[PDB]
């Protein structure tokens, strides 16, 4: 029996994301019109099981958290997906110590990984950011989070 497929997620799993050549967005609808760092060709890693795939190769309509389909949020007529995760999402410049902070850096609310997916091989992965602390982009960014509760 193979390992748990990357489409299968459980709360408390560790998610590793790489965002190559990520670029800054001034406003992101799935983040409540707040800044984001997003990548054309990001990659997602489940650290516990060692399974991984490119985000653009993932059929986000059939991705499960705790056995339940992922929350879908439609803003601007675009389907966005929400991978919740306990605590804030920590991201840094790839291979270097310089670090970014999310928009709600000063509060107690957590964050979630957002994916825009077109039915097909085109997905964008969105990470909450407060400003251009890592620059305007393109810039390689690595992020780390721990999968959180199934949203209600």
């Amino acid at each position, epitope marked *: 029996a193979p390992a748990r497929p990357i489409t299968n997620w459980r709360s408390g799993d560790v998610v590793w994301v790489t965002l190559p050549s990520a670029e800054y967005a*001034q406003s992101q609808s799935a983040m409540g019109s707040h800044p984001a760092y997003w990548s054309e060709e990001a990659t997602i890693i489940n650290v516990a099981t060692g399974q991984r795939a490119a985000v653009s190769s993932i059929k986000w309509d059939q991705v499960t958290l705790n056995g339940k389909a992922l929350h879908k949020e439609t803003h601007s007529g675009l389907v966005y997906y929400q991978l919740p995760l306990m605590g804030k999402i920590n991201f840094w410049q790839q291979g270097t110590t310089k670090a970014g902070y999310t928009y709600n850096y000063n509060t107690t609310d957590s964050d979630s990984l957002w994916v825009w997916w077109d039915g097909g091989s085109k997905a964008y992965l969105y990470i909450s950011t407060y*400003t*251009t602390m890592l620059g*305007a*982009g*393109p*810039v390689n960014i690595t992020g780390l989070g721990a999968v959180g509760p199934n949203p209600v």
Partner: antibody
Amino acid sequence: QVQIVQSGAEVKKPGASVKVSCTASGYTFTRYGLVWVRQAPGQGLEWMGSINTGNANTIYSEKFQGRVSITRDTSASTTYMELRSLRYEDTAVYFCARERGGSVVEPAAHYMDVWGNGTTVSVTS
Amino acid sequence: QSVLTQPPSVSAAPGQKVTISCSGHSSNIANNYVAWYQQLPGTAPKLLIYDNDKRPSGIPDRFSASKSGTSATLGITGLQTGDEAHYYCETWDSSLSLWVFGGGTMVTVL
């Protein structure tokens, strides 16, 4: 591919309302922002104001009290710059460029990668 | 009266090196990122450097830049004659809320 085309050269009088337009093609109009920079005959680059092609948000230079308005037309994929009460100092080449970044919070980063060839505005008599 | 003061002009022999300086005032450069542009005579400005050291895909390796403290530095290793252009540094200023440009620097191969 990516291109930005501006209007033609303009000759005006002391006190007028110039409107210079910048049409962009080859990319998603709302994905990026647009800037407006003027350059006098002998002078450097002077930022005038930016626009948000998605939310029509605008910032301006405080050099002009109120004389500048930047407007977008998403359907026509063009931006418009307006100047008012012209004197013999608005005589400059006016550049429209594509914005990458654009934050004004203190860790701010923003550059212009695709430029227009500019429009020459003259204020004479 | 440019906020980001630059040398008016620099020069080097063909194949030599030039460094272009760009002084700030600790509200411009010390905190924010800096971009570099070059303008050939009678043409549109061109992107050279963004995010204080990054090159767009069309710029060769001769152009390198870095920023330390209140000043940012642009350099060209190998000065071909086709580099007769003005060079500008740009960053945000918080005191005067603007995208201030550098004053320009005309490099001449002579």
